[PDB]
Design a protein around this nucleic acid. Structure first.
Lengths: 181, 283, 130, 127, 240
RNA sequence: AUUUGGACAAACUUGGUCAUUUGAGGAACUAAUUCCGUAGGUGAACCUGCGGAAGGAUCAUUAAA
RNA sequence: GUGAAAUUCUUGGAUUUAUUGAAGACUAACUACUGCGAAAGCAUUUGCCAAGGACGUUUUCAUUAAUCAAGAACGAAAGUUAGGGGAUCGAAGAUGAUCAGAUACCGUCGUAGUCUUAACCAUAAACUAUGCCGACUAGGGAUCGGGUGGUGUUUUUUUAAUGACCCACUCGGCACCUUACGAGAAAUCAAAGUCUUUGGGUUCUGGGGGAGUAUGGUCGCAAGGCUGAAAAAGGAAUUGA
């Protein structure tokens, strides 16, 4: 009853996949019992589950999601967390999805999201217990459902233009409330 | 909120209010209560309305013990949905968002007060004082100018507020025309709305819009229905036959090519009279 | 409090493990350290300003013995408690009664009218004093 | 040996449909919906909601006798966003767990070549 | 919401009782693909009923299934293409289908389009010898030489226009000399794009040359004989 | 269709009638982000449409096998 | 649909699914510190009409040039007049909810506009916050257009193209990185430089903030011309006397 899945890897995320590959297949094969492969002649990773060795039906889907998140550009240990639990999701969107920005404005907006030395993005991640990755313009958020909702909320305010000072204030408020609860 | 910080401007408001010792004064927005104590000193009866129990309680504890307590009255809650008894003078320091409905409720108030000293935004007060032919002229300006006479009093900077807001204000004196002119509010409102849909166009074009002729068609049709007569058959649209009717009235008036921003009250009322004669009623 | 604008050293896996698992252990660490070093200081000053020899106060896992024990080592805490603090008496639970301090329990209904009045005036003057 | 359906997973931004159909999408088999399994409206687009939705549709599909499904996930597309959300991810996981044989996953999100204006207005939509 | 506090709207006035039992009243049909592909039996579909053979025949004359050549042919390397078949002649539980269109998968398109090269899209409308008016979209990307050092490989508008002309004339020559069954037989093993490469090999070195999409626009007068031949008569059992 | 005479006679008035419900005194008892051009604004301590500007805080990945 | 809801639409089956059809805009990814243009501005395909820079040139005229008031051409978005079309978004407006918190102030409908032709309007942080023409004064790579040369791969060979890459050179661009023996109060500037105090040609222009005041320095904008009321413990109080 072997069951298969295929997920492609862009090139700029294909070098690090090789670099940290040796820390990738052990969690796939030892704890999920999931035969793996990398068709480097089609730049894809193929996960197939064996009829007899695997146990959990959902192991295949969690594995596909884990590799997919790593492909979108998350750190290896973060993606491993996505394997470990069962309630971690990834949400993506774009600056033009929020507000149509052209060229230099869009660059400034990504600058305002990142904050100097990433201070802002790290603040959001630490506050709401999620991981954010800016692609060129796509931005991706990994975390629990309500957490990524809050992170998206703050990020969208940043995109519209609230300065990082006010945004950071709001973050510390919600952080205090979440810590007390 | 924002706190007043000038007893001299309070003195000025009272002086230009020019209270008579036989009056009853309706006060909106007491604040810390200096105006309340001054008006209780000057006038005969005072009723002050408030929506915030905290300033209400602080005011009543500030006034309790004085002999003017028998004459002062305080009314709590929102006052757009309650009954307001007759008051000879009005004084208002309210936040503006209710202030516009305050103006219109006061004008609509049966047995309207003699004078009302109000505080408004600088822009809003320029709107109320907007004379025809001035850029600020608005439908609100037309309504208020032909149901009441308005006149500026003084201008209040943002710096005279704790904490200061960022829109400069002013104090204005509103005098309801007693008696009210014998014109229908709803019809006059419909006229102003249609003509001021875009204040700098031509009224011919403003009528040339679609939904305006649709509504006018329905109104004239129900008018001729209650009068119990039928119209001549139109080759195209009933909206178009009443459109040519409006064309006739516009050409005979010779107002079709005039700016809504430059027409005065007199032109508007003459146009309304022409419509009333021809059988058009916007309400 | 304050947030951390530096990169988090532990990923989601770890922070959720932490959420899976005296106020601040750092606070007790600093407290213990300052206590020790202050003991050192008072040692130094007592040596300087006393008249008689004073020894260095002390030096500063697995099951431990307690050589000091502020009880005779054969006394049960059930026997070290005193009757007042394990049961005083207080106001009765049912609304139909009042229960004074000295252990009488009253029923509001079976009291006579004058009794009702006198108990009243007593409660009134107590509440007035308070 | 088996038979295939097509599970169309419309993960809107504040709801989720899991609509199973036959090949050729004509004959709809079972359709459930977020709030429909979750009686509220904050949670009408929640991963828990989609999980229950997919479980029930797996039941109904196993009723009809279809054992495998290709899947076409979808976001609202258009001028709005264009990537399937947590709702769709949750539905997919729940169903593959439920044990229908997943055949081929696609993301058929309608991506406008050249869209009209979007609802926000010049100042920007959200917040 | 099915909550108690979700107040009733005009809405839930008069319902209808679930008594129909739809998937008991319905019925199963199996379809078959033309003889070009290798696996011709693919999936089954549902027909509302059979009381109206009008309904049965009409539903299955409107149907159009859409499969992936990997499933159709057994080789997993055609995973990204995806064809559309429409059934138009039905007989004895068993549907006969012919070619109706092509596409890639959105994943593959996003996968091919990268950032430091030029995209070229050619677009030709033609008609086969079978009288099937057709529309073909092809794409190509300007790759780079084996000793490039320049970061990008951009082509000039002149090279772009030349390559578009070559692609257009190749596509139209091929699919005007062909027939539609012959068209699919060519389009399966990626041979038109091998031609496109081998022709444009002197203007500019390209990569990822693909016939992106095929679109039917008009169909000729129907031909049941042609269908049966393309797929490569019966008695009953004496009920009494 | 219309017409005669009765009783019933709804309903109304003026009441009478009994019946039941519902205002301040007396008298008891119990209980205790900044900005620009233009256009507009009536729930305006300011807001909105359209086109612009920075005179506004960039982290991670990235040649190729 | 939002933070939360709500008008709204839904047994005459809405949201969703499949196959099509129409209508009007729009031209995604490819999109870069790249291109074009006098600026505003300009991205689907093919065709036609003219136009343009650069480069190549042992072609040609032979000072025809530079700076320049008046005037003219064009001039984003909004706006006006008259026609056309009117899918989408959408000032005004009409409405829902007004629930704490605004940390998370919006939802449904929508005139005018947006689109188009013919005229007006002539303004923007129209920015490289800096009149133009000429000349000289530092190194370095990359990149776009043209040309010359070299060399091997990619290519192909009596048919119609003979293009891609690499390397040196080369004019001309969009910008960039290093620094100035220079300049400047400093930021910075390849011009904002051109050896201590000054002449390459030419046009326009000049002699901070808030406050407090005088106004004949001046321009706007107002009203009414029958209409009026007379001191309290004679308290507080489930808390008191």
């Amino acid at each position: 009853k072997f069951e298969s899945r295929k997920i492609m890897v862009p090139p700029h995320r294909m070098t690090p996949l090789r670099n940290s590959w040796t820390k990738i297949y052990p969690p796939l094969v030892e704890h999920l019992k999931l035969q793996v492969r990398m068709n480097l002649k089609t730049k894809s990773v193929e996960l197939r589950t064996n009829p007899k060795f695997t146990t959990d039906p959902g192991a295949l889907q969690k594995g596909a999601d884990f590799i997919k998140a790593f492909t979108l550009g998350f750190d290896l240990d973060d993606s491993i967390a996505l394997l470990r639990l069962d309630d971690l999701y990834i949400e993506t969107f774009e600056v033009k999805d929020v507000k149509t920005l052209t060229g230099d404005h869009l660059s400034r907006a990504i600058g305002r999201i990142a904050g100097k030395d990433g201070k802002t993005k790290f603040a959001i991640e630490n506050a709401t217990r999620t991981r954010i990755v800016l692609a060129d313009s796509k931005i991706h958020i990994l975390g629990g459902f309500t957490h990524i909702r809050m992170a998206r909320e703050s990020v969208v305010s940043l995109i519209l233009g609230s300065p990082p000072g006010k945004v950071y204030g709001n973050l510390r408020t919600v952080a205090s409330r979440l810590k007390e609860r | 909120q924002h706190i007043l910080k000038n007893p001299l401007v309070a003195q000025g408001i009272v002086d230009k209010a020019q209270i008579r010792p036989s009056d009853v004064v309706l006060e909106v927005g007491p604040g810390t209560g200096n105006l309340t104590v001054r008006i209780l000193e000057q006038a005969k009866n005072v009723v002050a309305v408030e929506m915030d129990p905290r300033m209400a309680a602080e005011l009543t504890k500030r006034v309790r013990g004085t002999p003017v307590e028998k004459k002062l009255e305080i009314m709590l809650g929102d006052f757009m949905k309650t009954e307001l008894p007759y008051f000879d003078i009005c004084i208002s320091n309210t936040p503006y968002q209710i202030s516009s409905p305050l103006v219109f409720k006061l004008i609509n108030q049966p047995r309207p007060p003699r004078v009302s000293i109000l505080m408004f935004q600088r822009e809003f007060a320029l709107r109320l004082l907007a004379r025809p032919g001035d850029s600020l002229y608005c439908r609100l300006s037309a309504n208020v100018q032909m149901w009441a006479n308005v006149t500026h009093i003084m201008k209040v900077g943002k710096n005279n507020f704790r904490p200061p807001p960022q829109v400069e204000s002013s104090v204005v004196r509103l005098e309801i025309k007693n008696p009210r002119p014998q014109v229908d509010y709803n019809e006059w409102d419909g006229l102003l709305r249609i003509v001021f849909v875009r204040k700098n166009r031509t009224i011919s074009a403003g009528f040339k819009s679609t939904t305006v002729m649709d509504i006018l068609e329905k109104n004239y049709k129900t008018f001729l229905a209650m009068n119990n007569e039928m119209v001549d058959d139109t080759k195209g649209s009933m909206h178009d036959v009443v459109k040519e009717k409006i064309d006739t009235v516009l050409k005979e008036t010779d107002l079709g090519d005039k700016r809504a921003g430059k027409c005065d009250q007199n032109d508007f009322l003459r146009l309304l009279y022409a419509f009333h004669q021809v059988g058009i009623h916007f309400s | 409090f304050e947030l951390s604008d530096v990169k988090s050293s532990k990923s989601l896996a770890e922070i959720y493990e932490d959420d899976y698992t005296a106020l601040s252990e750092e606070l007790q660490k600093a407290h213990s350290e300052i206590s020790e070093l202050y003991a050192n200081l008072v040692y130094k000053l007592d040596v300087l300003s006393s008249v008689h020899f004073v020894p260095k106060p002390a030096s500063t896992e697995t099951p431990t013995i307690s050589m000091e024990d502020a009880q005779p080592l054969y006394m049960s805490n059930a026997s070290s408690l005193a009757p007042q603090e394990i049961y005083n008496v207080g106001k009765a639970e049912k609304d139909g009664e009042i229960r004074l301090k000295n252990g009488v329990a009253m029923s509001k209904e079976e009291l006579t009218r004058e009794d009702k009045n006198r108990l009243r005036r007593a409660l009134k003057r107590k509440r007035s004093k308070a | 040996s088996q038979v295939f359906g097509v599970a169309r997973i419309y993960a809107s931004f504040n709801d989720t449909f899991v609509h199973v159909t036959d090949l050729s999408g004509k004959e709809t088999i079972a359709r459930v919906t977020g709030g429909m399994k979750v009686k509220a409206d904050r949670d009408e687009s929640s991963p828990y909601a989609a999980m229950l939705a997919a479980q029930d549709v797996a039941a109904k599909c196993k009723e009809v006798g279809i054992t495998a499904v290709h899947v076409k996930i979808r976001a609202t597309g258009g001028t709005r966003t264009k990537t399937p959300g947590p709702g769709g991810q949750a539905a997919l996981r729940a169903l593959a767990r439920s044990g229908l044989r997943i055949g081929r996953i696609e993301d058929v999100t309608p991506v406008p070549s050249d869209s009209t204006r979007k609802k926000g207005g010049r100042r920007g939509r959200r917040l | 919401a099915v909550g108690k506090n979700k107040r009733l709207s005009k809405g839930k006035k008069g319902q209808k009782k679930r008594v129909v039992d739809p998937f008991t009243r319905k019925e199963w049909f199996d379809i078959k693909a033309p003889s070009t592909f290798e696996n011709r039996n693919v999936g089954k579909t549902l027909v509302n009923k059979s009381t109206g053979l009008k309904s049965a025949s009409d539903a299955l004359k409107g149907r159009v299934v859409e499969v992936c050549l990997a499933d159709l042919q057994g080789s997993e390397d055609h995973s990204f293409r995806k064809i559309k078949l429409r059934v138009d002649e039905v007989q004895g539980k068993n549907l006969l289908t012919n070619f109706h269109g092509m596409d890639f998968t959105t994943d593959k398109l996003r996968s091919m389009v990268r950032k430091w090269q030029t995209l070229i899209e050619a677009n030709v409308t033609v008609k086969t010898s079978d009288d099937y008016v057709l529309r073909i979209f092809a794409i190509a990307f300007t790759r780079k030489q084996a000793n490039q050092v320049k970061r990008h490989s951009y082509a000039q508008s002149s090279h772009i226009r030349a390559i578009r002309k070559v692609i257009s004339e190749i596509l139209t020559k091929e699919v005007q000399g062909s027939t539609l069954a012959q068209l699919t037989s060519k389009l399966i093993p990626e041979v038109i794009n091998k031609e496109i490469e081998n022709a444009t090999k002197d203007i500019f070195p390209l990569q990822n040359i693909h016939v992106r999409k095929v679109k039917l626009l008009k169909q000729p007068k129907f031909d049941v004989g042609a269908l049966m031949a393309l797929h490569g008569e019966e008695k009953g059992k004496k009920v009494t």
